[PDB]
Amino acid sequence: VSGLANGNGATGDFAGSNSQMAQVGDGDNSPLMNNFRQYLPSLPQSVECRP
Amino acid sequence: MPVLLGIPLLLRFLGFLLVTLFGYLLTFLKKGFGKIAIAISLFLALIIGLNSILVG
């Protein structure tokens, strides 16, 4: 239960949730919340000012 | 150290019951750690499930 939170891993009966907890993620990168990023509205960029 | 004819068998039996009963407590402990495995699994499966609906 400590290894499914530290990110060290779990061996035993808690060995199925080691692939469910890889989808959650670690830090800023989350495989689950990066599925939403192929569908982001395309906003224009920033260029210098022309009259 | 002289003793009567039945005392040594009362003393061996009072430690057979103890090991048998302490054997059952182990079996039940292991079962309850299996419930917390099922529970965690379920939760994380419901999250991964909602994701697939919403992104669709």
How far is Cα A36 from Cα B55, in angstroms, rounded to an integer?
Answer: 6
Question: 3-class SS at A49?
Answer: coil
Task: Report yes or no: A7 and A26 within 8 Å, Cβ to Cβ.
Answer: yes
> Residues of B at the A interface (Cβ-Cβ below 8 Å)?
33-34, 36-37, 40-41, 44-45, 47-48, 51, 55
DSSP state of A47: -
Q: How far is B24 from chain A (nearest CA, A)?
A: 20
Instruction: List all residues 6 or more positions away from B32 whose beta carbon is below 8 Å from its beta carbon.
Output: none
Q: How far is B25 from chain A (nearest CA, A)?
A: 19
How far is Cα A39 from Cα A16, in angstroms, rounded to an integer?
Answer: 30
Q: What is the resolution of this structure in A?
A: 3.0
